[PDB]
Amino acid sequence: MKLSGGVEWALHCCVVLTAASRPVPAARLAELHDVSPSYLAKQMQALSRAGLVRSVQGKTGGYVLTRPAVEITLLDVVQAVDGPDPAFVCTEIRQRGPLATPPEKCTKACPIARAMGAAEAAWRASLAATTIADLVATVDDESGPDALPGVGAWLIEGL
């Protein structure tokens, strides 16, 4: 099982966008992280379709967050980039074969499906409990208070 490789890039992008006082073009985000502009654009566009960033046009355009950092969870970002579908997909195999779960016993999910679902709930709940704000606060502590504003400064030059 592998998480969409864009998740790491998107999360970092959300973090540095909190430090940008103005819209940031996908190309400058890509230059900061030394990554393919077209590739980074794809992840930003997934964030966009999830209502977490918006692009605003022109030449002075680029990307902004659409609400405060405290209101965007790692689960919001992970589901935008990697998708909403649960890791385990029950295909109702219990209804196959000569000793299939009879038709009126199919009103509850399969117990295996249920147990798998509960670990999904725990992965989701962990991701929902942390915000972009939380990440920023940790970076502030570990890198020092000037680090992210230094990045933000660099991000907006020429604008």
Ligand X SMILES: O=S([O-])[O-]
Q: What DSSP string runs through 64-86?
A: EESS-GGG-BHHHHHHHHH-SS-
Does 120 participate in binding ligand FES (rule CB under 6 A)?
Answer: no
- Toward ligand X, which CB reaches closer, 30 or 77? 30
Q: Which residues bind ligand X (CB under 6 A)?
A: 28, 157-158
Question: Mask: binding to ligand FES, 48-87, rule CB under 6 A, as x and -?
Answer: ----------------------------------------
41 is in an annotated binding site: no
110 is in an annotated binding site: yes
Answer yes or no: are the C-beta atoms of 112 and 37 closer than 8 Å: no
Query: Token pair for residue 86?
Result: 């649960």
Cβ–Cβ contacts within 10 Å for residue 116, how many? 17
Does 90 participate in binding ligand FES (rule CB under 6 A)?
Answer: yes
If you search the block for the tokens 């002075």, which residue do you land on? 60
Does 110 participate in binding ligand FES (rule CB under 6 A)?
Answer: yes
CA distance 106 to 124: 26
Of residues 27, 70, 100, 112, which one binds ligand FES by CB under 6 A? Answer: 112
Length of the chain: 159
Q: How far is the CB of 141 from its own copies (least distance, A)?
A: 9
Does 134 participate in binding ligand FES (rule CB under 6 A)?
Answer: no
Q: Is the dihedral of CA 37, 11, 68, 19 positive or negative?
A: negative
Annotated binding site for [2Fe-2S] cluster: 8, 12, 90, 93-94, 110, 113
